[PDB]
Structures are given as structure tokens and as C-alpha cells.
């Protein structure tokens, strides 16, 4: 439990710090 | 093994002895990232700059390889200057062969980094190539001919960029060979140590003691490199090179890469063409004279307080020159730069050798 | 439509540092304009004023932008 | 006489678990080594990643 | 003059070490470039495909590209022709060459904006200050025709007239288009244009820090472990007497 | 250079402990800090002065440059 | 044999035949306003054609020539005073003077 | 008192803090190596231990307790008579090589 957990946890922290700013966060407003 | 494992090493060398391996790592890092950049770079003046933006924008991870190469060059010099400083302070230069090869290595890396900076063909690229090659025009009777021969024309142009790519590509490998000779000469004597006293009575195996220290060092170097690449990739660079080369206009605040600033300040301090170029050359070649200027009966500065003060004055002076090299040629910087330039040579040629003799008399030998 | 920038600039130039600089600028204005021939201009004074004011503007302007 | 040679006291350096000269240190050897092994295995995985 | 006015530091949402760009702001910034700056400034290194997954969906970007006409060919007759733009096309250049650009701007050359934020000390702080910093010349300053006074431009005389003002454009999300808002958004878009790797390097940076936070103390412990043999060794000198 | 052919040494005894028998960070702070202070006080008089000079020349020179470009220094 | 081979390789780095093809350049003086220094690319480097003012002309006339490091009277460097034409390359190390 | 600066310099130099004597710190050239080779067993062995002790202290970034520091007044050159003769012999060979 390293690369998976490490990568997901870090991505989670990153996305949390940048909540609402990333494309994946606003994408729904423009998108089958 | 005879380059690792059972190699006898002093029991007391400090972290200042870690820079040799960090330099090897910097060189391998540069060669690897460099080779990968060369797989996408084109040296035609019409496409050079574009190919670099292509690397950073469309090549997978091209941006990290590019900025690791750029900042890797900076880490290379930080390590070079620390390595040379260690040698001066501890009297390691008494290993004449190792030291002189060392001087050649410093000059070759400078030449390599200069040519590399020319490849993206930005404004700094073009004018750096212009100014540095013209240093040869200071040579009497044949200077101008030599410059045009190097350029492959009457000005920096297509022929210049293409040959610089070729020279920049191969020189690093020559550096690698020369570095291996640097090490073969060092192995004949073994390493110097902080006390400057022979350590034959207290040697320890290179492995595991220094293999582990070297790894720790490698990790710290990588931390420093990636902090720059991932959090401040342009911090040590120049914004002007983000502008394509324009042969009809030299930026008004043009300045050299940070690791060349001290030498630039020295050259700028002399209002004579030949005088400045000679001072520039001597600012580096004086390293080859240091061994001949050693007056102390002791090898290291560890036990020499006066020499130490002058040593740190020399470091503070290089810092002064670095600062001045980054300022405009205006008062009061012009005078400070001239005083700093004079002090540089005065410290190495007169003050340090004199302090050594004074220290000798104080110890009655 | 009102740009927050106008509002913020107005509040910021109320600060002592800005008023002082504004007074030096206005003083330069009177001096230079009262002259037919001169090579002086009030660029220095204006820049001192803008430096003090914009430092302040930069500290709060974005709270009004999306 | 070589018999006047006694190893100096190392009590200021010893790990707590091997401070009692009247106790065998074999009972803690597994724990003391297991830790270092854990440190080396974790480093290897970190570097591999 | 030779006097200098350096831009202040604005609290951009992407200023922090682990702070990403605000993609809605990038989207609005693109609109500013498209509607305003593109008439005079090129952006040679950015293509419609680069916008996908950053500030527009693929369908939206394709639609944006189809808004312009680009030259292509030659065809079977050896003729060049016009077609709707597509994702692979780079943003249209307003002029065929810099000479024409200068001819259309009183001799001044609007630089390519692809790297403007990286090509200028101050980055977006400079661009924002410049865009929102036009004012009347100070007393005693007289500018030649075609030049405008801007305290943030070196020398203070710039060949670009104030490009933005209130309502210079209408945003797709209703955001009030005040001058400062427009500048803030175009500067954010310009940051992305010059450094598209921006968000990813910071994410990688966080992982690098977490990994070093782990590995450094461990390797240091390995170092201390091995060296303890030497650090606690004791010596004795027993010469025969 | 090889162990066995380095130099001549007589009458020296060396005592050592296995790394597993000892602490890797003995008195890291209770002694580490005091020694660091000793080493710092011990060199600061040789190292610091030149940089204090740099600092002074820098601040004086920078301020001098500024004043020189103004109307009323 | 060695002299021939070495000089051939050395020669290969010298300006190639396409680089040596040179020609003059015609300039339209009317396009250049008084006080303006205009730069053109010519034979590889900048070519300055500057329309000088009376004041500039007079200032250059007042220079104490014997104190110059490269002593030349202004009138030995121009055909028509209002026009100064120079190769825009600093004689130190090649940059373009502003 | 030149002697005052001398004792001050001796301590500032600090090799005494590692328990070294001045001759223990001399840079070894070929004359010095020959002189050291000529040392009687006891002086050679003493030299070896003081150097080994110093290198060990250096590795630990430590120094001896003040009461064990070499004293300015007690530091005498054990190497001088041997080194002087080695240099004299070399100079003699050099003069003969000149003829
Ligand atoms: C690392 C080493 C590299 C250094 C290079 C040194 C060169 C070695 C010398 C080669 C000896 C072999 C004999 C060759 C005889 C060729 C005859 C010759 O030179 O004809 C002249 C003629 C010039 O004619 P023009 O244009 O009309 O005259 C202009 C007015 N000056 O030049 C030529 O033919 C050039 C042809 C060169 C072929 C040689 C290539 C081999 C290169 C050498 C590197 C390898 C090492 C060889 C080992 C040495 C063996 C003796
Ligand atoms: C090239 C120009 C580049 C620009 C210059 C920028 C220089 C910036 C300064 C960074 C230096 C920081 C390091 C300070 C270390 C402080 C310190 O510990 O000093 C005291 C300490 C005491 O050690 P010992 O006497 O052996 O006794 C040990 C007792 N337990 O001294 C040392 O560590 C000596 C180490 C010296 C190496 C430092 C080298 C710094 C760089 C200099 C550049 C080199 C010169 C020539 C290059 C130009 C060609
Ligand atoms: C050569 C040694 C230099 C090491 C460079 C480290 C590097 O490039 O980072 C790799 C990587 C970062 O995470 P990624 O999964 O690659 O990014 C994707 C995020 N969505 O891991 C590290 O930083 C390792 C620590 C060094
Ligand atoms: C034509 C009518 C223009 C429009 C629309 C915009 N710009 Fe411009 N810009 C123009 C010119 C002729 C110049 C050259 C100015 C000079 O005197 O050199 C510029 C320059 C800029 C710069 C560069 C400033 C510098 O530091 O050199 C920037 C950063 C800039 N312009 C930005 C910019 C933006 C973002 C615009 C849309 C909001 C914009 N410009 C519009 C001409 C024109
Ligand atoms: C590509 C650059 C270089 C590489 C790879 C390199 C590598 C090394 C290595 C591995 C060592 C042993 C470890 C150490 O003591 O740091 C060493 C020692 C040394 N190097 Fe370098 N070096 C380089 C450049 C130079 C330069 C520029 C100089 C000096 C002008 C130099 C002078 C020395 C000396 C004198 C030693 C002996 C140090 C001692 O034992 O005290 N080196 N070098
Ligand atoms: C001693 C090792 C080296 C040093 C010090 C060095 C240094 C540099 C420098 C300073 C640059 C400019 C970076 C920038 O700002 O863009 C550069 C560019 C470049 N280097 Fe190197 N380099 C080294 C080795 C190599 C090698 C071995 C290759 C190729 C086999 C290489 C390929 C390139 C390429 C293609 C560029 C242009 C792309 C770019 O600008 O990033 N380099 N190098
Ligand atoms: C085959 C084996 C060849 C291996 C070659 C490399 C080598 O010899 O590795 C060694 C560990 C060497 N390091 C030392 O000699 C060394 C000596 C004393 C102290 C430390 N460290 C702390 O006190 C050292 O690290 C060191 O770092 O050199 C590189 C520079 C060499 O690399 C090169 O020459 C190329 C760039 C290749
Ligand atoms: C074909 C290969 C050739 C001709 C290689 C020759 C290399 C020579 C030397 O290396 C050995 C040289 C790089 C080294 O001199 C010791 C440097 C410290 C020179 C420092 C240097 O840099 C500048 C620079 O980078 C610039 O960039 C934008 C601009 C510069 O002024 C406008 C300079 C400059 O005025 C000087 C002195
Ligand atoms: C690791 C600390 C290095 C010193 C930080 C400042 O670094 C300097 O920043 C300037 C402005 O950004 C640059 O123009 C300059 O080239 C750079 O060296
Ligand atoms: C490190 C010492 C700082 C250097 C001080 C320079 O000082 C400057 O020197 C000029 C020389 O022409 C003078 O004209 C000027 O008035 C003076 O302030
Ligand atoms: C910031 C405002 C400073 C005023 C300078 C403007 O100056 C004007 O610019 C015009 C551009 O179309 C020219 O046609 C006109 O001749 C010129 O006087
Ligand atoms: C003294 C100047 C000698 C410089 C070495 C190159 O010299 C050149 O070699 C060419 C190839 O053979 C010749 O065609 C050319 O005439 C000759 O000047
Ligand atoms: C490296 C700087 C040289 C300065 C001369 C030092 O001089 C020394 O200073 C000591 C501290 O006050 C005094 O106790 C001592 O008697 C005196 O000789
Ligand atoms: S002053 Fe050196 S190239 Fe002009």
C-alpha cells in the first residue's frame, strides 16, 4: 500500500487545497 | 572496487568532501536530461526556440526534463564552487595533478554551459554567443580571424548555432573522461582531510561509511534540484531568454547567468579591452598558480586564523563581485566593482602568501 | 458599473503616506507648470505616490474580484 | 600485563535493553535487528517508487 | 525617464506553493485574449487543442476553432485555400509579419504573448499593473504622437493605448466586466499560456516533499547507525616503558 | 593504496561496539546543541566579519544608488 | 599530406560560399525624421543611419579631439553633418549600442 | 611582547586543543618524510598516537578537556634536528650537481 495509497492521498490533499479551482471541479457546468 | 568498496578513506572528512560525488551526479543528470532534450531539439535558427517550446508544451514530461536540465546546470556550478572552495581552504591543491586537471574541468564545464545557453536562441543566447566568442578578438593580429572562424561567418548566425549544438553534445562526454582521470590521480594519494595532516594512521573503508554519506548527499542534492524545478523553475533564470533572438537589439539590462556574474564584474571593471579580457582569463587561471603561492608550513587553514580571515574575505569579495555583476554600470557600483576586482587579485597574490609567512614566524619556523 | 479598483484607490490614497506624496506631487506641479522653459517634470513625485498607493491597493483589491 | 586491559565502560552509549550485564541480550536482539530491517525495507520501497 | 516603478505583489490564487490556477479565471482570461488582445498580439505557441481539459470541453474548443478561417493547402490545383479552424490549429496571427505589425501600430511591435508573463520581471504582477496603470503624464512630460504614459512601462512611454476598460467585453458567466476584473482574468490566462505545466509541477512537488520527508530521515538514520561504530570507539596508547 | 600497506603503527588499542548494541543518536540535543554552540562561537570571529562588511557595503551602495537618481538626495 | 588534410577540415569551419555573397544596400533618407536613429540589417549586422539635429551636430563639433582614445574630428566621419552612418556594433565585444 | 601575540596566536591556531604539538601539523614534503623516518621509535610512536587521537577528535567534531591542551610553553620541536640535517644533506648534493 504505497504507490496507490500515496498517489491517491496526495491527489486528495492537492484537490482539497484547490477546491473549486481545478477543471475536474467545474467540468460539470460545461459537460452525455 | 578500486574506485569504491575497500578504498581507504580518512576517518574525519566532513560534508565538504561530498561535493565530488555530487559533481559526478550533476554530470550524469545533465547527460541524461540532455540526451532526452536532444531527441527533440533542432538547431536551425528558424526552429531552435520553437523546438524548445515544443518540448515544454507537447512532449510528455518535456517540461520537467527541460527545467531539470536548466536548473541542473545551476546546481552543477553551486557544487563546483563549493568543491573548489574546499580545496583552497584545506590545501588540497598540493595534489598538483588532481588540482590542475580540476582547473581544466572547471574551464570545460564553463564552456559547455555557455554553449548550452546558446541553443534555445533567445536574446541572452544570441548576445552571450556574441560577447563570449568575441573575447578572442582581444588576441593580437589573429583575434578577429579566429572569431569569424568560430562563427563560421562575419556574425553569429545559422552556422554558429549548428556547431554549438554539436560541441555542447560532445564536450560533456569529454568532461566525463577527464573526470575519471581526475579520480585516478587522486587515488594515487588518497584524500586530504580537515586537519591537513596525513591520515594514514586512521583510515576507514569507503564502504559503508562514505557510500552511505554520499547517498545522503545525493538525496539532499535531489531535494534542492526538485525544489527549484517543481516550485521555482525560473528563479535562477533570466526572463530575457524567453524572447527570441533579435540581432538588431541588445536588451538594455542584459546580464550573464548568475554563476558567471563575478567574472563579468571583473571584466567590466577594466576600461581597456585587452586588459579586461586578460583579467577575466587570469581570474580563473590564477587557480593554477595557487600551489606556487603556498607559503605556510601547514597544509590546511584549519590551524591558521589569519589565513582563515583572508579566505572568508575572499568569499565575501566574490559575493560582492556577484552582486555588482548584476547591477548597472553606474556610480557607486563602478567603484565598488573596481575595488572588489583589485582585492580579489590582491588577496590571492599578496595578502594570503604574506599571511602564511607571518603565521610561520609566529610559530617559530 | 463601478470598478472596485476606483473604490479601493480612493480609500488607499487616504493613507498618510499617499497624502504626503500627493502633496509633494502637487507641489512639483505648481513649480513646473509655472515655468515656460525647464527640463524638470514630475515623474519622480508621481512614481512615489503610485508606489505608496498601489502597495495598499494590492493588499485588498482582489477581495472584490471574482 | 595484557591482563591489565579492561574494555572501557560504554553504558552512556548502550541501548537501554542491553544495559544489564547480568541479563542475556539475545531476548532483544530480534527487536533491535527488526527495526533496522524495517528502516532498510522502507527506504528501498521509497526509492523504488 | 530612467526612474523605475516596480509592481506590487498581488495575492493571486495561484501564488502559494501548492496553489493551482483558478480554471474559471483562465476561461474568462481566454475570452479577453480572444475578443481584445488578439487583434494586435499573436500567441504563436498555443493551439485550440491546448484549451481542452483546461478551460473548455473538447466540443467547446472545436466550436471556438470553427469561429475562425485558416489557410490550408495547396489543393489538387496547387492552390492555397480557406477552411474552418480545428483543434490542431494554433491561434490566428493578427499580422503576416512583424513589419506589418509595426506598420499597423505606429512603428511599435506588439510582442507575442505566449510567454509574456515569463519574459518579464514581475510576471503577472507587472502585466496587471501595466494594464490597470495608465494615467495622465506628470506635469512636464510631453509624449510624441502615438505614445501613452504608463508608470509601469520602462521609460514610461508605451506604444500600446489602454487596451481594456469597463465592459470592453461580456463574459460567458455573467461576471461583471470591470477593468480590474478583466485584467485579473487575462493575467491568469497568460500565466497558464506561459506555464501550462503549472498545476502539475505543484502536485508533483507535494509528492516530492512527502517522499523526501520520509526518505531523508530514514537514510540519515542509516548513516548514524553505521557511523555509531566510529562515533563511540575509544583509543588507548600502551607503549612499553 | 591498500589496507596492509599504509603505514607503521605500534601499541595502539581501539575498542568498539556493534551498532546494534548502541544508540544512533546518543544525547543528540543535550550534547549536540552545546557542541554546535561551541563550534559556532569558535568560528564566528573568523567567518562573520567579512560578510558583515559585505552587508554594509551592499546597503550603503544600494541606498547611495537610489539617492543619486532622485531630485533631492 | 597532413598539412593539406588539416587545412581542409579547418577550412570547412570558415564561412561557406553562401555566406560570402554580399551586396550594397539603398536607403531612403526621407523616411528617417530628424533625431531618429534607424537600424537596418546589412551584411549580417546592424547598420545605423541617424538623422542628426543642429544641437547634436554642434555638440560633436565642440569635442576636444586630442583627448579622444580614438582621435577623429566629427567631420572626418560624415559626408553630410545631418547624417551619421555607422555599423551598429560596439567595438568592445560586439553588442548593439542603444 | 611579540611573545604575547605568540601565545595568543598559538591558542587561536588551536592544534593544541586536539592535543597536537606544532611539528605534528607540518606539511609533509620529501624532506619531512625522510626526517620522520629517522625519528627514534619512541618519538615516532608518540607522534603517531597524537595524530590518531587528533583525527579521531576531528571526526567527532570534539576537542580535549582544557587541562589536556598542549601548552605553548611546553611545545618543543622534536623534528628540527632531524629535518635540518636532511635539508643540509640535500643542499650539499645540489651543490655537487651544480659543478
Ligand atoms: C588523429 C589523427 C588525425 C590527424 C590528421 C593527419 C593526416 C594524416 C596524413 C595522411 C597520410 C596518408 C597519405 C595521403 C596522401 C594524399 C595526398 C594529398 O594530400 O594530396 C593533396 C590534396 C590537395 O589538393 P589541391 O586542392 O589541388 O591542393 C591545394 C593547395 N595546397 O589533399 C588531399 O588529397 C586530401 C585527402 C586526404 C586523405 C587522408 C585521410 C586520412 C586522415 C587521417 C587520420 C588517420 C590517421 C592516418 C595514420 C597515418 C598514416 C601515415
Ligand atoms: C565563484 C563566485 C560565486 C559567488 C560566491 C557566493 C558565496 C556564498 C557563501 C556561502 C558559504 C557558506 C558556508 C559557510 C560555512 C561556515 C563555517 O562552518 O566556517 C567555519 C569552518 C571551520 O572548519 P575547520 O577550520 O576545518 O575546523 C573545524 C572545527 N570543528 O570552515 C569551513 O567549513 C571551510 C570550508 C570552506 C568552503 C567554502 C567555499 C565557499 C565558496 C567559495 C568559492 C570558491 C573560490 C574560488 C572560485 C572562483 C574561481
Ligand atoms: C533523477 C532524480 C530526480 C527525481 C525527480 C522526481 C520527479 O520527477 O517526481 C516524481 C514523483 C512525483 O509524483 P508523480 O506520480 O510522478 O506525478 C503525478 C501527479 N498527478 O515522485 C517523487 O517526487 C519522488 C521523490 C524524488
Ligand atoms: C492593438 C490596438 C493592441 C491591443 C488590442 C493590445 N495591445 Fe498590447 N501592445 C500593443 C503594442 C503596439 C505594444 C508595444 C508597446 C511598445 O511601446 O513597445 C503592446 C505591448 C504590450 C505588452 C508588452 C509590454 C512590455 O513590457 O514590453 C503587454 C504585456 C501587452 N501589450 C499586453 C496586452 C494585453 C493582455 C492585451 C489585451 C488585454 C493587449 N496588450 C492589447 C498593441 C495592442
Ligand atoms: C566535473 C567536475 C569535477 C568532478 C566530477 C570532481 C570529482 C571529484 C571527486 C569524486 C573527488 C573526491 C571526493 C571529494 O573530495 O570531493 C574530488 C577530489 C578533488 N577534486 Fe574534484 N572534481 C571536479 C572538479 C574539480 C575542480 C574544479 C577542482 C579544482 C580547480 C577539483 C579539485 C579537486 C581536488 C584538489 C580534490 C582532492 C580533495 C581532497 O581530498 O581534499 N575538482 N573531485
Ligand atoms: C556538463 C553538462 C552539461 C551542462 C553544464 C549543460 C548546460 C546547459 C545549459 C546551461 C543549457 C540551457 C538551458 C536553458 O536555459 O534552456 C543547455 C541546453 C541544452 N542542453 Fe545541455 N548541458 C550539459 C550537457 C548536455 C548534453 C550531454 C546534451 C546532449 C547529449 C545536452 C543537450 C542540451 C540541449 C538539447 C539543450 C537545448 C534545450 C534547452 O535549452 O533546454 N546538454 N545545456
Ligand atoms: C566503474 C566505477 C566508476 C565510478 C566512477 C565514480 C567514482 O569513482 O565514484 C566514487 C564513489 C567517487 N567518490 C570518491 O572518490 C570520494 C572520496 C572521498 C570522500 C567521498 N565522499 C564523502 O566524503 C567520495 O565520494 C565519486 O563520486 O566519483 C565520481 C565523480 C565517479 O564518476 C565519474 O568519474 C563519472 C561522472 C563516471
Ligand atoms: C567555441 C567555444 C568557445 C568560444 C568557448 C569559450 C568559452 C569561454 C569561457 O569558458 C571557458 C567563458 C564561458 C567564461 O570565461 C572564463 C565565462 C566566465 C565568461 C563570462 C561572461 O559571460 C557573459 C554571458 O554569459 C552573457 O550572457 C548573456 C553576456 C555577457 O556580456 C554581455 C557575458 C560576459 O561579459 C562575460 C565576461
Ligand atoms: C536559493 C536563493 C537564491 C537567491 C534568490 C534570488 O535569485 C535572483 O532573483 C532575481 C529576480 O527574480 C533574478 O533576476 C536573478 O537572476 C536570480 O539570481
Ligand atoms: C567599498 C567602498 C565603496 C566605494 C565608494 C565609491 O564612492 C564614490 O566614488 C566616486 C568616484 O568617481 C565619486 O565621484 C563619488 O562621489 C563617491 O561617492
Ligand atoms: C496616457 C495618455 C497620454 C496622452 C498621449 C496621447 O497622444 C496622442 O496619441 C494619438 C494616438 O492615436 C495620436 O494620434 C496623437 O497625435 C497624440 O498626440
Ligand atoms: C597561415 C594561415 C593558415 C591557416 C590554415 C588554413 O589555410 C587555408 O587552407 C585552405 C584549404 O587547403 C586553402 O584553400 C586556403 O587557401 C588556406 O589559406
Ligand atoms: C585575527 C585578528 C587579530 C587581532 C589581535 C588579537 O590580539 C589578542 O586579543 C585577545 C582578545 O581580547 C587578548 O586577550 C590577547 O591578549 C591579544 O593579544
Ligand atoms: S561595452 Fe562590451 S560589447 Fe559593448
Short mmCIF file of C-alpha atoms in Angstrom, two decimals, chain E:
data_model
loop_
_atom_site.label_atom_id
_atom_site.label_comp_id
_atom_site.label_asym_id
_atom_site.label_seq_id
_atom_site.Cartn_x
_atom_site.Cartn_y
_atom_site.Cartn_z
CA UNK E 1 12.97 58.52 -17.75
CA UNK E 2 15.46 56.17 -16.12
CA UNK E 3 13.35 56.05 -12.97
CA UNK E 4 11.74 52.74 -12.15
CA UNK E 5 8.45 51.73 -10.64
CA UNK E 6 8.25 48.07 -9.69
CA UNK E 7 4.86 46.34 -9.49
CA UNK E 8 3.45 45.35 -6.09
CA UNK E 9 2.68 41.73 -5.24
CA UNK E 10 -0.93 40.80 -5.87
CA UNK E 11 -2.39 37.85 -3.95
CA UNK E 12 -3.06 35.66 -6.98
CA UNK E 13 -4.97 32.49 -6.04
CA UNK E 14 -2.09 30.59 -7.64
CA UNK E 15 0.66 32.36 -5.68
CA UNK E 16 1.02 29.71 -2.95
CA UNK E 17 3.46 26.79 -3.36
CA UNK E 18 0.67 24.20 -3.60
CA UNK E 19 -1.87 26.59 -5.10
CA UNK E 20 -3.22 25.78 -8.56
CA UNK E 21 -4.52 28.20 -11.15
CA UNK E 22 -8.21 29.07 -10.97
CA UNK E 23 -9.52 27.47 -14.15
CA UNK E 24 -12.73 29.51 -14.34
CA UNK E 25 -10.46 32.56 -14.33
CA UNK E 26 -8.36 31.00 -17.11
CA UNK E 27 -11.55 30.50 -19.09
CA UNK E 28 -12.55 34.16 -18.69
CA UNK E 29 -9.00 35.25 -19.44
CA UNK E 30 -9.12 33.39 -22.72
CA UNK E 31 -12.24 35.34 -23.65
CA UNK E 32 -10.34 38.57 -23.02
CA UNK E 33 -7.47 37.46 -25.27
CA UNK E 34 -9.88 36.25 -27.96
CA UNK E 35 -12.04 39.41 -28.01
CA UNK E 36 -9.47 42.07 -27.15
CA UNK E 37 -5.73 41.30 -27.34
CA UNK E 38 -5.82 39.00 -30.38
CA UNK E 39 -6.49 41.91 -32.74
CA UNK E 40 -2.90 43.08 -32.20
CA UNK E 41 -0.99 40.33 -30.32
CA UNK E 42 -0.16 36.85 -31.59
CA UNK E 43 0.11 33.79 -29.36
CA UNK E 44 2.08 31.56 -31.71
CA UNK E 45 2.67 28.68 -29.29
CA UNK E 46 -0.89 27.98 -28.13
CA UNK E 47 -3.40 25.89 -30.05
CA UNK E 48 -7.12 25.26 -29.64
CA UNK E 49 -6.33 21.68 -28.52
CA UNK E 50 -4.37 23.07 -25.55
CA UNK E 51 -7.60 24.55 -24.14
CA UNK E 52 -9.24 21.11 -23.86
CA UNK E 53 -9.44 19.87 -20.29
CA UNK E 54 -8.06 23.17 -19.02
CA UNK E 55 -10.85 25.72 -19.50
CA UNK E 56 -13.13 24.34 -22.26
CA UNK E 57 -14.53 20.91 -23.20
CA UNK E 58 -13.39 19.37 -26.47
CA UNK E 59 -16.72 20.27 -28.08
CA UNK E 60 -16.41 23.88 -26.89
CA UNK E 61 -12.83 24.22 -28.17
CA UNK E 62 -13.82 22.72 -31.52
CA UNK E 63 -16.58 25.33 -31.70
CA UNK E 64 -14.11 28.07 -30.82
CA UNK E 65 -11.78 26.89 -33.58
CA UNK E 66 -14.59 26.81 -36.12
CA UNK E 67 -15.16 30.51 -35.46
CA UNK E 68 -12.07 31.38 -37.49
CA UNK E 69 -10.84 30.66 -41.00
CA UNK E 70 -7.33 29.38 -41.58
CA UNK E 71 -5.31 28.90 -44.75
CA UNK E 72 -4.52 25.36 -45.85
CA UNK E 73 -3.45 23.51 -48.96
CA UNK E 74 -2.18 23.53 -51.62
CA UNK E 75 -5.06 21.57 -53.15
CA UNK E 76 -5.06 19.38 -56.25
CA UNK E 77 -4.75 22.51 -58.40
CA UNK E 78 -1.79 23.75 -56.39
CA UNK E 79 -3.90 26.49 -54.81
CA UNK E 80 -3.99 27.56 -51.16
CA UNK E 81 -7.47 27.86 -49.63
CA UNK E 82 -9.55 28.77 -46.57
CA UNK E 83 -11.24 26.37 -44.15
CA UNK E 84 -12.86 26.40 -40.70
CA UNK E 85 -10.26 26.15 -37.97
CA UNK E 86 -9.86 22.97 -35.97
CA UNK E 87 -8.37 21.79 -32.69
CA UNK E 88 -4.89 21.26 -34.17
CA UNK E 89 -4.62 24.85 -35.46
CA UNK E 90 -2.67 27.45 -33.49
CA UNK E 91 -4.32 30.75 -32.62
CA UNK E 92 -4.50 33.04 -35.67
CA UNK E 93 -1.82 35.68 -36.05
CA UNK E 94 -3.18 39.19 -36.50
CA UNK E 95 -0.38 40.07 -38.93
CA UNK E 96 1.62 38.10 -41.54
CA UNK E 97 4.88 39.56 -40.26
CA UNK E 98 6.35 41.97 -37.67
CA UNK E 99 6.89 44.63 -40.32
CA UNK E 100 3.14 44.76 -40.95
CA UNK E 101 2.53 44.69 -37.21
CA UNK E 102 4.68 47.79 -36.73
CA UNK E 103 3.10 49.45 -39.76
CA UNK E 104 -0.31 48.98 -38.13
CA UNK E 105 0.81 50.21 -34.71
CA UNK E 106 2.71 53.44 -35.43
CA UNK E 107 6.05 51.64 -35.58
CA UNK E 108 5.54 49.78 -32.32
CA UNK E 109 5.62 45.98 -32.27
CA UNK E 110 3.06 44.18 -30.09
CA UNK E 111 5.02 41.19 -28.77
CA UNK E 112 3.80 37.60 -28.93
CA UNK E 113 2.01 36.88 -25.66
CA UNK E 114 2.63 33.11 -25.37
CA UNK E 115 5.43 33.72 -22.81
CA UNK E 116 4.95 37.37 -21.88
CA UNK E 117 4.48 36.53 -18.19
CA UNK E 118 7.75 34.57 -18.12
CA UNK E 119 9.51 37.05 -20.39
CA UNK E 120 9.02 39.95 -17.98
CA UNK E 121 10.32 40.61 -14.47
CA UNK E 122 7.29 40.78 -12.23
CA UNK E 123 5.27 38.32 -14.28
CA UNK E 124 1.53 38.80 -13.92
CA UNK E 125 2.12 41.44 -11.25
CA UNK E 126 3.78 43.51 -13.96
CA UNK E 127 1.19 42.79 -16.65
CA UNK E 128 -1.72 43.53 -14.28
CA UNK E 129 -0.08 46.76 -13.04
CA UNK E 130 0.60 47.78 -16.63
CA UNK E 131 -2.93 47.06 -17.84
CA UNK E 132 -4.58 48.90 -14.93
CA UNK E 133 -1.89 51.55 -14.56
CA UNK E 134 -2.42 54.04 -17.38
CA UNK E 135 -2.74 57.63 -16.16
CA UNK E 136 -2.11 61.13 -17.45
CA UNK E 137 1.53 62.22 -17.94
CA UNK E 138 3.02 64.06 -15.00
CA UNK E 139 3.47 67.78 -15.37
CA UNK E 140 6.45 68.49 -17.61
CA UNK E 141 6.23 65.25 -19.59
CA UNK E 142 5.35 65.51 -23.28
CA UNK E 143 4.94 62.35 -25.34
CA UNK E 144 5.43 62.11 -29.09
CA UNK E 145 2.31 61.18 -31.08
CA UNK E 146 1.35 57.52 -30.71
CA UNK E 147 2.79 57.09 -27.22
CA UNK E 148 0.91 56.76 -23.92
CA UNK E 149 2.05 57.36 -20.39
CA UNK E 150 2.30 54.27 -18.24
CA UNK E 151 4.28 54.43 -14.97
CA UNK E 152 4.95 50.68 -15.05
CA UNK E 153 6.46 50.52 -18.56
CA UNK E 154 10.23 51.08 -18.68
CA UNK E 155 10.79 54.70 -19.67
CA UNK E 156 7.09 55.33 -19.01
CA UNK E 157 6.16 55.86 -22.68
CA UNK E 158 4.37 52.89 -24.26
CA UNK E 159 3.09 52.40 -27.81
CA UNK E 160 0.01 50.48 -26.70
CA UNK E 161 -3.04 52.53 -25.89
CA UNK E 162 -5.04 51.36 -22.85
CA UNK E 163 -6.44 48.07 -24.21
CA UNK E 164 -9.08 47.47 -21.55
CA UNK E 165 -11.81 49.38 -19.71
CA UNK E 166 -15.20 48.71 -18.14
CA UNK E 167 -17.35 46.48 -20.36
CA UNK E 168 -14.69 46.05 -23.04
CA UNK E 169 -16.33 42.62 -23.34
CA UNK E 170 -19.12 40.49 -21.91
CA UNK E 171 -18.15 37.31 -20.04
CA UNK E 172 -19.88 33.98 -20.69
CA UNK E 173 -20.66 33.51 -16.98
CA UNK E 174 -22.07 36.96 -16.24
CA UNK E 175 -19.09 38.12 -14.16
CA UNK E 176 -19.11 41.95 -14.06
CA UNK E 177 -16.52 43.02 -16.65
CA UNK E 178 -14.88 45.89 -14.75
CA UNK E 179 -11.40 46.88 -15.93
CA UNK E 180 -9.66 45.32 -12.92
CA UNK E 181 -11.65 42.09 -13.30
CA UNK E 182 -10.74 41.83 -16.97
CA UNK E 183 -7.06 42.40 -16.21
CA UNK E 184 -7.04 39.89 -13.36
CA UNK E 185 -8.54 37.23 -15.63
CA UNK E 186 -6.37 37.83 -18.70
CA UNK E 187 -3.26 37.79 -16.49
CA UNK E 188 -4.33 34.43 -15.07
CA UNK E 189 -4.88 33.13 -18.60
CA UNK E 190 -1.46 34.46 -19.58
CA UNK E 191 0.10 32.60 -16.65
CA UNK E 192 -1.41 29.37 -17.96
CA UNK E 193 -0.31 30.17 -21.51
CA UNK E 194 3.32 30.68 -20.44
CA UNK E 195 3.37 27.78 -17.98
CA UNK E 196 0.75 25.12 -18.79
CA UNK E 197 2.71 22.68 -16.57
CA UNK E 198 1.95 24.96 -13.60
CA UNK E 199 -0.62 22.85 -11.74
CA UNK E 200 1.15 19.56 -12.37
CA UNK E 201 4.55 20.66 -11.13
CA UNK E 202 2.99 21.74 -7.83
CA UNK E 203 1.13 18.44 -7.42
CA UNK E 204 4.39 16.60 -8.13
CA UNK E 205 6.08 18.98 -5.72
CA UNK E 206 3.79 17.92 -2.89
CA UNK E 207 4.56 14.27 -3.57
CA UNK E 208 8.27 15.02 -3.75
CA UNK E 209 8.11 16.76 -0.36
CA UNK E 210 6.16 13.88 1.20
CA UNK E 211 8.65 11.35 -0.20
CA UNK E 212 11.69 13.31 0.99
CA UNK E 213 10.07 13.80 4.37
CA UNK E 214 10.14 10.01 4.55
CA UNK E 215 13.41 9.04 2.89
CA UNK E 216 15.72 11.71 4.32
CA UNK E 217 15.19 10.87 7.99
CA UNK E 218 15.47 7.14 7.19
CA UNK E 219 18.72 7.39 5.23
CA UNK E 220 20.05 9.72 7.94
CA UNK E 221 19.24 7.03 10.48
CA UNK E 222 21.13 4.53 8.33
CA UNK E 223 24.08 6.93 8.28
CA UNK E 224 24.08 7.37 12.07
CA UNK E 225 23.66 3.60 12.55
CA UNK E 226 26.79 2.72 10.56
CA UNK E 227 28.84 5.60 11.93
CA UNK E 228 27.98 4.78 15.55
CA UNK E 229 30.77 2.18 15.44
CA UNK E 230 33.26 5.00 14.87
CA UNK E 231 31.49 7.68 16.93
CA UNK E 232 31.70 5.63 20.17
CA UNK E 233 35.05 3.92 19.65
CA UNK E 234 37.73 4.52 22.27
CA UNK E 235 41.51 4.56 21.95
CA UNK E 236 44.33 3.64 24.30
CA UNK E 237 48.08 4.08 23.85
CA UNK E 238 50.14 1.47 25.67
CA UNK E 239 53.79 1.94 24.74
CA UNK E 240 56.28 -0.34 26.52
CA UNK E 241 58.18 1.59 29.19
#
